[PDB]
PDB file of N, CA and C and ligand atoms in Angstrom:
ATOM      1  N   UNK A   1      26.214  60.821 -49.975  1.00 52.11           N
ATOM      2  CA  UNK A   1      27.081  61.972 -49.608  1.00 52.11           C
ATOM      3  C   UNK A   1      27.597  61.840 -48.187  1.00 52.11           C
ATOM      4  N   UNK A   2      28.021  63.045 -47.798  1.00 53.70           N
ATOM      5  CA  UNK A   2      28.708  62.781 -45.984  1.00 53.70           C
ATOM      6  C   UNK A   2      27.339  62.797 -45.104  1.00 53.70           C
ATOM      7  N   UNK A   3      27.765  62.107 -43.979  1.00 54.68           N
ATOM      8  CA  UNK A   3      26.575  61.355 -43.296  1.00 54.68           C
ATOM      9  C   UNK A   3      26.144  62.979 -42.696  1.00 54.68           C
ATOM     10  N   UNK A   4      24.519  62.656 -41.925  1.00 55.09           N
ATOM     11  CA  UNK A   4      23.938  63.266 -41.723  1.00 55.09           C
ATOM     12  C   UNK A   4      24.379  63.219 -39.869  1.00 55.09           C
ATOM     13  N   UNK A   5      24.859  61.947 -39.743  1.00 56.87           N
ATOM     14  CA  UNK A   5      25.132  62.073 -38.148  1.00 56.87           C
ATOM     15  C   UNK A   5      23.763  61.537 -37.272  1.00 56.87           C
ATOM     16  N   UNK A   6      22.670  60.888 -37.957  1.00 54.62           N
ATOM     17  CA  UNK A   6      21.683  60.776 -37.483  1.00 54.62           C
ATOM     18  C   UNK A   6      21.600  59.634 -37.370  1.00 54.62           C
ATOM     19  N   UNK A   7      21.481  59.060 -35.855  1.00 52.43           N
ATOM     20  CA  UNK A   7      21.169  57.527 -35.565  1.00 52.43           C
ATOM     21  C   UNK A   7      20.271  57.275 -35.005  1.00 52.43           C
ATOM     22  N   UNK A   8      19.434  55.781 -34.963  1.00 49.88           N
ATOM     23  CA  UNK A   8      18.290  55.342 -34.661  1.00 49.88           C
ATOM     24  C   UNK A   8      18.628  54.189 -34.233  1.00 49.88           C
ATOM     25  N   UNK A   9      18.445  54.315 -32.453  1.00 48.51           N
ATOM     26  CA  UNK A   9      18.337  53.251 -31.372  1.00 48.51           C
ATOM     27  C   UNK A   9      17.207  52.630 -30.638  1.00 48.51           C
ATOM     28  N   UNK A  10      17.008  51.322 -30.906  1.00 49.84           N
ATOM     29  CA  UNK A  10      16.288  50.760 -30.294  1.00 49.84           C
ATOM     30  C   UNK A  10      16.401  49.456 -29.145  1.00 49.84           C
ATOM     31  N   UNK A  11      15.722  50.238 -27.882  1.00 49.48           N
ATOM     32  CA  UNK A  11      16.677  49.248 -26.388  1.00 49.48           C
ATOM     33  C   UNK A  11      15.308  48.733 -25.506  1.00 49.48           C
ATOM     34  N   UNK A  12      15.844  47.196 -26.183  1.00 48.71           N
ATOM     35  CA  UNK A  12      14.679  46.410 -25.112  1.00 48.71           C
ATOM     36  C   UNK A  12      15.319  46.653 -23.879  1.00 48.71           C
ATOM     37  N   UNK A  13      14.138  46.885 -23.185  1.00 46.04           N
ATOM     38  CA  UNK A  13      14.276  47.303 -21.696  1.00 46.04           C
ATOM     39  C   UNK A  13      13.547  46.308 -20.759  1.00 46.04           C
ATOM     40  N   UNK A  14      13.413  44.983 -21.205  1.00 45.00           N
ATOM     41  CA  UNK A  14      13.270  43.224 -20.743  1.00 45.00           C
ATOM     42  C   UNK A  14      14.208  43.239 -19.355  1.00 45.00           C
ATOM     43  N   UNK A  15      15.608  44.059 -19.389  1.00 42.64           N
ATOM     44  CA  UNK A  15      16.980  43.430 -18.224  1.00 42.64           C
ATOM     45  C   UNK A  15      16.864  44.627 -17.619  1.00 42.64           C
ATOM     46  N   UNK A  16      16.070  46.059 -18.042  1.00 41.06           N
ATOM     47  CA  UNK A  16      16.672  47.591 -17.783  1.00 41.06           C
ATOM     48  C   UNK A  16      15.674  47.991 -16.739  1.00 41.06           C
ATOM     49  N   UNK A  17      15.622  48.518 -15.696  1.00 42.95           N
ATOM     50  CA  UNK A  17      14.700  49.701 -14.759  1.00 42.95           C
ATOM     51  C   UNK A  17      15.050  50.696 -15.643  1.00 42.95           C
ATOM     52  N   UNK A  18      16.110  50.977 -16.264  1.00 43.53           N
ATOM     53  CA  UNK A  18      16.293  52.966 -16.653  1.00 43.53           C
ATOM     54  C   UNK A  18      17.177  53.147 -18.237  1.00 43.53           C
ATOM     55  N   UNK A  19      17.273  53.907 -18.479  1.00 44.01           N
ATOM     56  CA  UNK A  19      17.771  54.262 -19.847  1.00 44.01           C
ATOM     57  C   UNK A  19      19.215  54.552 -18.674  1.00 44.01           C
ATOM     58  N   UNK A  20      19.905  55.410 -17.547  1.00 39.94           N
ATOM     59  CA  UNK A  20      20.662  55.342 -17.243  1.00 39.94           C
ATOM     60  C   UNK A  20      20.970  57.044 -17.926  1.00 39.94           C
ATOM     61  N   UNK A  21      20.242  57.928 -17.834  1.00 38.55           N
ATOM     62  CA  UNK A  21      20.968  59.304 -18.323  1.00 38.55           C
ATOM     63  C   UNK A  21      20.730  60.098 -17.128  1.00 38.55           C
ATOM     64  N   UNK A  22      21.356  61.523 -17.850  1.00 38.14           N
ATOM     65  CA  UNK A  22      21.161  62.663 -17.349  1.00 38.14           C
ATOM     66  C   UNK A  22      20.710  63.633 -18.726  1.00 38.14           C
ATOM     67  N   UNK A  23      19.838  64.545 -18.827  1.00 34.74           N
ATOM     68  CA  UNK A  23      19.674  65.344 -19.949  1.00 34.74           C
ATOM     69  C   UNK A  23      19.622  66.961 -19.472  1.00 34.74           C
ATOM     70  N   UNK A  24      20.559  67.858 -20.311  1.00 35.97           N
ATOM     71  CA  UNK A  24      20.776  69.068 -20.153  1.00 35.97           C
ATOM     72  C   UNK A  24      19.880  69.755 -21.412  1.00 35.97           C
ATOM     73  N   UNK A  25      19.955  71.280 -21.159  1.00 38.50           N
ATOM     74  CA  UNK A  25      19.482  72.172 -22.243  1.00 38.50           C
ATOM     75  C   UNK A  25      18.250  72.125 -22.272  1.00 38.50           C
ATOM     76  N   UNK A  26      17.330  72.639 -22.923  1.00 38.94           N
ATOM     77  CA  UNK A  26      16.125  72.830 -23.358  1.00 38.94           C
ATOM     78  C   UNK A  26      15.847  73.539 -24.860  1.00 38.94           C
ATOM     79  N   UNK A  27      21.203  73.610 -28.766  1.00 39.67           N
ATOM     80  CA  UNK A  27      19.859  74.847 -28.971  1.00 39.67           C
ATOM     81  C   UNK A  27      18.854  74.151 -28.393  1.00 39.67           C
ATOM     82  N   UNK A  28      18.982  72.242 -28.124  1.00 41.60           N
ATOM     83  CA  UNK A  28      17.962  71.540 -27.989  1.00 41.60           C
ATOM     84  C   UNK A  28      17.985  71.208 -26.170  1.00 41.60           C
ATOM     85  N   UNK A  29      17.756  69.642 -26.486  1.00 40.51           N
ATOM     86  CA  UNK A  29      17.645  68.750 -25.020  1.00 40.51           C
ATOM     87  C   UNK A  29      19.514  67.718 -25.572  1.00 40.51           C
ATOM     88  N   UNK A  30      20.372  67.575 -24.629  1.00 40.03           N
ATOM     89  CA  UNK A  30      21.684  66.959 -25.210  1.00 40.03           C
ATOM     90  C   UNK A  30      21.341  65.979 -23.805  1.00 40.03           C
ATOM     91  N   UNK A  31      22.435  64.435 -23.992  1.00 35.91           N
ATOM     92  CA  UNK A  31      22.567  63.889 -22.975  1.00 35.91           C
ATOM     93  C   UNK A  31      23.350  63.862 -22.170  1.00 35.91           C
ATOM     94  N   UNK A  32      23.854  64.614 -21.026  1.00 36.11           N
ATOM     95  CA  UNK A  32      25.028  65.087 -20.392  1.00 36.11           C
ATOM     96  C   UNK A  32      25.593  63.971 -19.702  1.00 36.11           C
ATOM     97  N   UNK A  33      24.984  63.099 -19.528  1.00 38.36           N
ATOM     98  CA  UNK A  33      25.657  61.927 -19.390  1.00 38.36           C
ATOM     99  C   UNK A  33      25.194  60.423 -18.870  1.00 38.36           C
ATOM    100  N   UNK A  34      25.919  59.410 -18.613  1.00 43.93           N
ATOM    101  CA  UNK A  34      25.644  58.286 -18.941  1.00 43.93           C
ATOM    102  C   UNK A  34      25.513  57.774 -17.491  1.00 43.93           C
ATOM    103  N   UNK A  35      24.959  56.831 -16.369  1.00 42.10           N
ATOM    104  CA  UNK A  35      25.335  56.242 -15.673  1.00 42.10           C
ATOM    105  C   UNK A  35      25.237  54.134 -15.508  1.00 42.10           C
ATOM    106  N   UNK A  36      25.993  53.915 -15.334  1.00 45.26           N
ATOM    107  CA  UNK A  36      26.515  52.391 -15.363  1.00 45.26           C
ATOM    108  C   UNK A  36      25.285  51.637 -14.427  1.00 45.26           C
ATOM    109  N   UNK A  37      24.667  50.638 -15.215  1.00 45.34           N
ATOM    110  CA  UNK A  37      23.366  49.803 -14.885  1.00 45.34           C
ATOM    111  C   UNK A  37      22.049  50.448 -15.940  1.00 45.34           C
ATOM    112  N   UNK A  38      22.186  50.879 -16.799  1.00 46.72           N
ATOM    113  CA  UNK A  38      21.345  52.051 -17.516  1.00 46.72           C
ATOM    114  C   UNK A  38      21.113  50.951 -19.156  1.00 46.72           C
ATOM    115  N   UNK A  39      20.055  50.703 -19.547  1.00 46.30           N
ATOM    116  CA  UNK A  39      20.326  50.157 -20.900  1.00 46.30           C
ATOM    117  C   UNK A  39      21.359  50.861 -21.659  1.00 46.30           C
ATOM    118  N   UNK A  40      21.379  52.210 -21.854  1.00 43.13           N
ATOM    119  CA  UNK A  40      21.839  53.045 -22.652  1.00 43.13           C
ATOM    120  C   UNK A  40      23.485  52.936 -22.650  1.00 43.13           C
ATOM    121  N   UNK A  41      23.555  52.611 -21.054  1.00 46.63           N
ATOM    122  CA  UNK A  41      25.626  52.311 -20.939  1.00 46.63           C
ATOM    123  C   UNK A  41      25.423  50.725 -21.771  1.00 46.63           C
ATOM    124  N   UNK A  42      24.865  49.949 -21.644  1.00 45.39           N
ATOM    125  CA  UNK A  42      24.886  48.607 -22.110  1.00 45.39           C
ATOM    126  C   UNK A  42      24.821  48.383 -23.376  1.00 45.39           C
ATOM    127  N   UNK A  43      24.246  49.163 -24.274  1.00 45.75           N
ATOM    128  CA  UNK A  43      24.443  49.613 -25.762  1.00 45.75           C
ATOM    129  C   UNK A  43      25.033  50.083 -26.149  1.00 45.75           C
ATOM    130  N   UNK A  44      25.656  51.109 -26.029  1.00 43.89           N
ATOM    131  CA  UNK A  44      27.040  51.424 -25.779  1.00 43.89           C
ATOM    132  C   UNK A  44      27.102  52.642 -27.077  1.00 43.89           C
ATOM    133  N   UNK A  45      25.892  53.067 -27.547  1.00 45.11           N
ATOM    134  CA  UNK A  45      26.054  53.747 -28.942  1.00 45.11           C
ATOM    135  C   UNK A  45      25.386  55.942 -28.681  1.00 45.11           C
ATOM    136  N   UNK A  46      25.042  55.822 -27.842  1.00 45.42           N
ATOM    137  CA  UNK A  46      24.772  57.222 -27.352  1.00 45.42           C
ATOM    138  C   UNK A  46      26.230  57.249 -26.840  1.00 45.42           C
ATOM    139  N   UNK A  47      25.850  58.986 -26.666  1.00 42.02           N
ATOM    140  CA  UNK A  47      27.355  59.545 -26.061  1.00 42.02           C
ATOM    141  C   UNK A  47      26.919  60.843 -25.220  1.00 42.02           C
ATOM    142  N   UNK A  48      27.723  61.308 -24.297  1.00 39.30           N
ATOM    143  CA  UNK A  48      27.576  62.636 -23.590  1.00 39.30           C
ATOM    144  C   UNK A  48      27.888  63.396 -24.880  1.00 39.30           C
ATOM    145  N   UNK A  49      26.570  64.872 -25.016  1.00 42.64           N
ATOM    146  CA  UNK A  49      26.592  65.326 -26.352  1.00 42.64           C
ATOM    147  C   UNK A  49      25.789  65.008 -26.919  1.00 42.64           C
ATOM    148  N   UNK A  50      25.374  64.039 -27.365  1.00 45.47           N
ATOM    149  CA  UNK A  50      24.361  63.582 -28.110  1.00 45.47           C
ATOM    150  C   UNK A  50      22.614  64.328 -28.561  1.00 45.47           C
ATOM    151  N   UNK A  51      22.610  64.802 -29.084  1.00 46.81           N
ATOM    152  CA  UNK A  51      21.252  65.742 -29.211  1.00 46.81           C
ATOM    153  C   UNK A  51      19.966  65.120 -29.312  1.00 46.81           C
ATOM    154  N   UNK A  52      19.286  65.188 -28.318  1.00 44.98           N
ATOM    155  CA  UNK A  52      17.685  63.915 -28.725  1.00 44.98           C
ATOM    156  C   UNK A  52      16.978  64.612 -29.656  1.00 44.98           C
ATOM    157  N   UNK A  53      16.439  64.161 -30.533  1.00 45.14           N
ATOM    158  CA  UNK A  53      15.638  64.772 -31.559  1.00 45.14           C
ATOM    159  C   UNK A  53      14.258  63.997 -31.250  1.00 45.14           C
ATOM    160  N   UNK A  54      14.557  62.639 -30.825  1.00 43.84           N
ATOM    161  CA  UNK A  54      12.874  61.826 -30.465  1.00 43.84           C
ATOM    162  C   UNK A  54      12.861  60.621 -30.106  1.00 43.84           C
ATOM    163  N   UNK A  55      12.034  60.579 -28.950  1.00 42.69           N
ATOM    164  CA  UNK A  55      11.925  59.437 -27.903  1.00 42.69           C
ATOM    165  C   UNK A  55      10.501  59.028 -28.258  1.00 42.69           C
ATOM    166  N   UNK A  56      10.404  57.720 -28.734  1.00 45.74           N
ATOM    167  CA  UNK A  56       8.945  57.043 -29.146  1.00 45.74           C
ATOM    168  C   UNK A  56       8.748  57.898 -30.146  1.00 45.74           C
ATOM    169  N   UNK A  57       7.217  58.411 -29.225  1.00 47.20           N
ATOM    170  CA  UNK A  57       6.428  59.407 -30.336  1.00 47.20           C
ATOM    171  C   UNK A  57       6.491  60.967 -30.328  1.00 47.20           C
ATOM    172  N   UNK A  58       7.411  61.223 -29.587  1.00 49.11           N
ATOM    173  CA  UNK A  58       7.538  62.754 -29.007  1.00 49.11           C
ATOM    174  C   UNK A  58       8.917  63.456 -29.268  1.00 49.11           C
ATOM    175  N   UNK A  59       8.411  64.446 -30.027  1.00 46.05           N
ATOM    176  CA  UNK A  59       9.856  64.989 -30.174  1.00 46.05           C
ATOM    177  C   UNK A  59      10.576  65.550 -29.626  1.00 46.05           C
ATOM    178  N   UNK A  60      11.580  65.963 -29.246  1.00 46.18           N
ATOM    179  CA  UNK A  60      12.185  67.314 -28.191  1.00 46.18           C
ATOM    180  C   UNK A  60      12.659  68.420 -28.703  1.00 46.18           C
ATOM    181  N   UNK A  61      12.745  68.874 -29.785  1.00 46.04           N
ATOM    182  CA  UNK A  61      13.313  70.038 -30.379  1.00 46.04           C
ATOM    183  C   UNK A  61      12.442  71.217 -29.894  1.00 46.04           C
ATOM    184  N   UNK A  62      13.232  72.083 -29.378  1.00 48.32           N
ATOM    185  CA  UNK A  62      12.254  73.261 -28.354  1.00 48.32           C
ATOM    186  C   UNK A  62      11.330  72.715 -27.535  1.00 48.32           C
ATOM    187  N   UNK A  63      12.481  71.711 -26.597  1.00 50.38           N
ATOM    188  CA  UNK A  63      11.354  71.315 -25.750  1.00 50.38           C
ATOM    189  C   UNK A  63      11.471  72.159 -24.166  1.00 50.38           C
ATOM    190  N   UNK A  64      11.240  71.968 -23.149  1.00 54.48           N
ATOM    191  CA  UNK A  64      11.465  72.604 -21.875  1.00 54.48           C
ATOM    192  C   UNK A  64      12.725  71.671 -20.639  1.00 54.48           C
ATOM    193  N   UNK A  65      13.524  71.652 -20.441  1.00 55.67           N
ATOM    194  CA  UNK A  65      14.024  70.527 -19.553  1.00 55.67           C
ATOM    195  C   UNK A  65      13.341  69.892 -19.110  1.00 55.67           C
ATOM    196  N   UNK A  66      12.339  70.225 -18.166  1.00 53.95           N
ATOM    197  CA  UNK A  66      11.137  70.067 -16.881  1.00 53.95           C
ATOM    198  C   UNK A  66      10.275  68.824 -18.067  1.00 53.95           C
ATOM    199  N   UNK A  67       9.647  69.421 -19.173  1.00 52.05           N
ATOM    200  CA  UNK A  67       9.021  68.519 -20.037  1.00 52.05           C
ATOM    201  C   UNK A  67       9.501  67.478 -20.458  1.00 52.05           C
ATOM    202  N   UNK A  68      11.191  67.336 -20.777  1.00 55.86           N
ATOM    203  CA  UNK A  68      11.792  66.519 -21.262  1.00 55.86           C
ATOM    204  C   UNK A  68      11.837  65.436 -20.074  1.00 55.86           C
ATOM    205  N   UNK A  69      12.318  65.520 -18.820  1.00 53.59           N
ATOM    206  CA  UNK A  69      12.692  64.897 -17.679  1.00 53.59           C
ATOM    207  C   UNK A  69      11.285  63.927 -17.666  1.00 53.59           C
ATOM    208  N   UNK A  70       9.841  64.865 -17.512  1.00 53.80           N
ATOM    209  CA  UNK A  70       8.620  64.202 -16.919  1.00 53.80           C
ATOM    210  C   UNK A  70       8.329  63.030 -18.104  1.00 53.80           C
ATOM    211  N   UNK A  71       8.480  63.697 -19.208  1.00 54.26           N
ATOM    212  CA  UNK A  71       8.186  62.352 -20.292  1.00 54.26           C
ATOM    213  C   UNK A  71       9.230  61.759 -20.224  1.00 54.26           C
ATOM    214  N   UNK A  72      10.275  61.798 -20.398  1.00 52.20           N
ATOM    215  CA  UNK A  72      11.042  60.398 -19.994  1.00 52.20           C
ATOM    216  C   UNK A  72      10.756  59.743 -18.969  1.00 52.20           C
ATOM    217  N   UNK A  73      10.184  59.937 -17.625  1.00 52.06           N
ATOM    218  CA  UNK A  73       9.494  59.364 -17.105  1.00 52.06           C
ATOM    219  C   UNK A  73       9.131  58.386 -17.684  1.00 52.06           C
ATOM    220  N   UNK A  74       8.115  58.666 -17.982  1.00 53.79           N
ATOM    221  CA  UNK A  74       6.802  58.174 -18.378  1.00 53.79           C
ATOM    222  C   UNK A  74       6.962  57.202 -19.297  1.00 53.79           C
ATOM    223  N   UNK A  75       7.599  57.513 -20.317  1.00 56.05           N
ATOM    224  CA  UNK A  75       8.112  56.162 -21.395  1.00 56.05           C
ATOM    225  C   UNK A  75       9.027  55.465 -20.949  1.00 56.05           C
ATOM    226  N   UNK A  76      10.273  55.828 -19.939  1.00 55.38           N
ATOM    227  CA  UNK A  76      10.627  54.429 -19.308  1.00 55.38           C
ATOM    228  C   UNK A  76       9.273  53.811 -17.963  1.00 55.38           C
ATOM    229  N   UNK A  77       8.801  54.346 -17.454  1.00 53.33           N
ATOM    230  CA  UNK A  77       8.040  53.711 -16.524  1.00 53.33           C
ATOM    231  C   UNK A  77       6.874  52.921 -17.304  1.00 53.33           C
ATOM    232  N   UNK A  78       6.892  52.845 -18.775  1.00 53.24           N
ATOM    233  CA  UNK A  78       5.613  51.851 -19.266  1.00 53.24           C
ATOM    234  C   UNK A  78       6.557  50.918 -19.987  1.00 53.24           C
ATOM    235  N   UNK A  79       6.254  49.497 -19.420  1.00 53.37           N
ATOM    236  CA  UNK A  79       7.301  48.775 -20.386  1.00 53.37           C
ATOM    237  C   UNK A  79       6.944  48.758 -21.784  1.00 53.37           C
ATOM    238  N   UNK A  80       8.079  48.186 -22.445  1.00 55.45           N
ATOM    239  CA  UNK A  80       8.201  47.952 -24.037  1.00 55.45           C
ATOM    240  C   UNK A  80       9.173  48.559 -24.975  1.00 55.45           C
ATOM    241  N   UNK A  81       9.641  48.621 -26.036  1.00 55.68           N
ATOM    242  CA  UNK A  81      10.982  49.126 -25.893  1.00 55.68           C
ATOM    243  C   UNK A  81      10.960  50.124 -25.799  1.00 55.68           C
ATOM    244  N   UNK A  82      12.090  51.379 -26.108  1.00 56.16           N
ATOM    245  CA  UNK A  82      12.244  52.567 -25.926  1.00 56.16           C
ATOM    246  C   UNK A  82      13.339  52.865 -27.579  1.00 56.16           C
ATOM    247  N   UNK A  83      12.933  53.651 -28.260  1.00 56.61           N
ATOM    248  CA  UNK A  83      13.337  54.061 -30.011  1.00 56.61           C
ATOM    249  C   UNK A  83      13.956  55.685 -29.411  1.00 56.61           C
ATOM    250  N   UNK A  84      14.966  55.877 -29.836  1.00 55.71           N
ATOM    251  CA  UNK A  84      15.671  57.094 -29.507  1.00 55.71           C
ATOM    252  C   UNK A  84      16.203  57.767 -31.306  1.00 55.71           C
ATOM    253  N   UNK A  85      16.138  58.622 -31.029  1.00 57.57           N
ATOM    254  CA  UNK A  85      16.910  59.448 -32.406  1.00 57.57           C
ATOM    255  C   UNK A  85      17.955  60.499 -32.072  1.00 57.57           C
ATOM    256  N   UNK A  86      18.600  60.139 -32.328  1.00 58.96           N
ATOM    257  CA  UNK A  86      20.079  61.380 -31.590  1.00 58.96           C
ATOM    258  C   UNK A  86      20.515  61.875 -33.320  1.00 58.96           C
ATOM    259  N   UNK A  87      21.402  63.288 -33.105  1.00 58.25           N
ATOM    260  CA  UNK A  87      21.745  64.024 -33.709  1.00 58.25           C
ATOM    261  C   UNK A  87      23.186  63.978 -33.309  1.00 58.25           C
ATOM    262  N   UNK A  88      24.438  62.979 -33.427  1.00 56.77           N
ATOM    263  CA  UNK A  88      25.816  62.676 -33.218  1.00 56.77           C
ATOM    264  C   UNK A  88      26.695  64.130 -33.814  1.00 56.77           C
ATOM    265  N   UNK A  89      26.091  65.283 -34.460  1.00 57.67           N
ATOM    266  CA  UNK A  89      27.034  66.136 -34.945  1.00 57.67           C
ATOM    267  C   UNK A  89      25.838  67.658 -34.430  1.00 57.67           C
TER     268      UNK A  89
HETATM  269  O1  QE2 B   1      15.605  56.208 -17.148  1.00 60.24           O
HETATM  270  C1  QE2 B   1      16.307  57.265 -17.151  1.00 60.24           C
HETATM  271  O2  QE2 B   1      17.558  57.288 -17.201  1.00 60.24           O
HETATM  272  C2  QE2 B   1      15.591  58.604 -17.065  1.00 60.24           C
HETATM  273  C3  QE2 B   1      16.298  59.707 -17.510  1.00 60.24           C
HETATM  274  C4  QE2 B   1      15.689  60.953 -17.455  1.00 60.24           C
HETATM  275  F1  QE2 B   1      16.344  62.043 -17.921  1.00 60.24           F
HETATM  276  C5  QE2 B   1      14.384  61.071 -17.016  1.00 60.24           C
HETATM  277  C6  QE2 B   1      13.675  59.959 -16.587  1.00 60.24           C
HETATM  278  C7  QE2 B   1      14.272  58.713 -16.597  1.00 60.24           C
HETATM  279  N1  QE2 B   1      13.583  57.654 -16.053  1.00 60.24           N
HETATM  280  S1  QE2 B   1      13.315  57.649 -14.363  1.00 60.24           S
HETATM  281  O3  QE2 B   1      12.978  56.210 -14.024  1.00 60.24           O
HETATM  282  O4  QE2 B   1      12.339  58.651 -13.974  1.00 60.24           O
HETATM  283  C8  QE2 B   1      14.899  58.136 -13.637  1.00 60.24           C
HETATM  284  C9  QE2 B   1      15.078  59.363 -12.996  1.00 60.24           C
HETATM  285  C10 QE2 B   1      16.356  59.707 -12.569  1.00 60.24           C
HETATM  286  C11 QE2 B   1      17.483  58.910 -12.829  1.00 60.24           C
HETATM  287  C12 QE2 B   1      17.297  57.705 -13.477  1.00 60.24           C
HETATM  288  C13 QE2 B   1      16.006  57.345 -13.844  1.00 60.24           C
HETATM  289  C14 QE2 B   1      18.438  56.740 -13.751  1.00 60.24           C
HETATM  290  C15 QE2 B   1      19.802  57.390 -13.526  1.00 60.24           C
HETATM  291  C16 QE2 B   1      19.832  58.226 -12.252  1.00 60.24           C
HETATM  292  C17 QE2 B   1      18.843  59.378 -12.345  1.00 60.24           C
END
Protein backbone atom coordinates (compact mmCIF):
# COMPACT_ATOMS: atom_id res chain seq x y z
CA UNK A 1 0.00 0.00 0.00
CA UNK A 2 1.25 3.85 0.32
CA UNK A 3 4.43 3.99 2.22
CA UNK A 4 4.51 4.43 5.81
CA UNK A 5 7.34 7.17 5.47
CA UNK A 6 9.48 5.18 7.81
CA UNK A 7 13.24 4.91 7.25
CA UNK A 8 16.07 3.04 8.78
CA UNK A 9 19.66 4.55 8.81
CA UNK A 10 22.66 3.14 9.58
CA UNK A 11 26.12 5.53 9.83
CA UNK A 12 29.49 4.15 10.45
CA UNK A 13 30.98 6.75 12.37
CA UNK A 14 34.89 5.17 11.47
CA UNK A 15 35.47 9.13 9.45
CA UNK A 16 32.63 11.01 11.91
CA UNK A 17 33.30 12.95 15.55
CA UNK A 18 29.31 13.85 15.26
CA UNK A 19 26.05 12.92 13.64
CA UNK A 20 26.20 16.85 12.74
CA UNK A 21 22.45 17.90 14.10
CA UNK A 22 20.45 20.11 15.94
CA UNK A 23 17.14 18.53 17.58
CA UNK A 24 13.93 20.55 18.48
CA UNK A 25 10.57 19.62 20.35
CA UNK A 26 10.11 17.21 22.99
CA UNK A 27 4.34 16.12 19.11
CA UNK A 28 7.87 14.38 19.32
CA UNK A 29 11.88 15.17 19.19
CA UNK A 30 12.26 16.55 15.00
CA UNK A 31 15.77 17.37 13.52
CA UNK A 32 15.91 21.10 13.02
CA UNK A 33 18.79 20.85 11.28
CA UNK A 34 21.84 19.65 9.64
CA UNK A 35 25.46 20.97 9.97
CA UNK A 36 28.33 20.25 7.22
CA UNK A 37 31.27 17.75 8.62
CA UNK A 38 28.39 15.67 10.47
CA UNK A 39 27.99 11.89 9.21
CA UNK A 40 24.39 12.68 8.84
CA UNK A 41 25.18 15.72 6.02
CA UNK A 42 27.45 12.92 4.38
CA UNK A 43 24.55 10.48 4.01
CA UNK A 44 22.60 12.67 2.82
CA UNK A 45 19.11 10.82 3.70
CA UNK A 46 17.71 12.69 6.98
CA UNK A 47 16.17 16.02 6.50
CA UNK A 48 15.27 19.21 8.69
CA UNK A 49 11.75 17.80 9.88
CA UNK A 50 12.49 14.56 10.21
CA UNK A 51 10.84 12.93 13.40
CA UNK A 52 13.29 10.53 15.51
CA UNK A 53 11.35 7.71 16.62
CA UNK A 54 14.86 5.72 17.74
CA UNK A 55 18.45 6.03 18.18
CA UNK A 56 20.16 2.48 18.96
CA UNK A 57 18.17 1.20 21.75
CA UNK A 58 16.19 4.17 22.96
CA UNK A 59 13.28 5.56 21.82
CA UNK A 60 12.22 9.25 21.78
CA UNK A 61 8.56 9.45 21.49
CA UNK A 62 7.57 11.65 24.62
CA UNK A 63 10.84 12.20 25.25
CA UNK A 64 12.20 15.58 27.10
CA UNK A 65 14.65 17.81 24.81
CA UNK A 66 17.25 17.92 27.79
CA UNK A 67 16.96 13.83 27.65
CA UNK A 68 17.14 13.67 24.03
CA UNK A 69 20.37 16.06 23.71
CA UNK A 70 22.24 14.04 26.88
CA UNK A 71 21.68 10.61 25.18
CA UNK A 72 22.74 11.61 22.02
CA UNK A 73 25.62 12.38 23.72
CA UNK A 74 26.33 9.47 24.86
CA UNK A 75 25.74 7.20 21.80
CA UNK A 76 27.79 9.38 19.63
CA UNK A 77 30.60 9.63 22.28
CA UNK A 78 30.87 5.54 22.37
CA UNK A 79 32.16 4.40 19.12
CA UNK A 80 30.37 1.94 16.76
CA UNK A 81 27.74 2.65 14.50
CA UNK A 82 24.82 4.77 15.18
CA UNK A 83 20.96 3.07 13.67
CA UNK A 84 18.45 6.00 13.48
CA UNK A 85 14.62 5.59 12.68
CA UNK A 86 12.96 8.76 11.37
CA UNK A 87 9.29 9.27 10.64
CA UNK A 88 9.74 11.34 6.88
CA UNK A 89 5.79 12.22 7.04
O1 LIG B 1 26.68 14.46 17.25
C1 LIG B 1 25.73 15.29 17.21
O2 LIG B 1 25.41 15.96 16.20
C2 LIG B 1 24.91 15.50 18.48
C3 LIG B 1 23.65 16.04 18.31
C4 LIG B 1 22.86 16.26 19.43
F1 LIG B 1 21.61 16.74 19.29
C5 LIG B 1 23.32 15.89 20.68
C6 LIG B 1 24.58 15.34 20.84
C7 LIG B 1 25.40 15.15 19.74
N1 LIG B 1 26.69 14.71 19.95
S1 LIG B 1 27.78 15.77 20.73
O3 LIG B 1 29.16 15.23 20.40
O4 LIG B 1 27.46 15.92 22.14
C8 LIG B 1 27.51 17.38 19.95
C9 LIG B 1 26.93 18.45 20.63
C10 LIG B 1 26.65 19.61 19.92
C11 LIG B 1 26.86 19.73 18.54
C12 LIG B 1 27.42 18.66 17.87
C13 LIG B 1 27.75 17.52 18.60
C14 LIG B 1 27.74 18.70 16.39
C15 LIG B 1 27.09 19.89 15.69
C16 LIG B 1 27.23 21.17 16.51
C17 LIG B 1 26.50 21.03 17.85
Amino acid sequence: AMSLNIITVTLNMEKYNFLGISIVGQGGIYIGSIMKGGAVAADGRIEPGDMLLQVNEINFENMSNDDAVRVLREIVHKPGPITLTVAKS
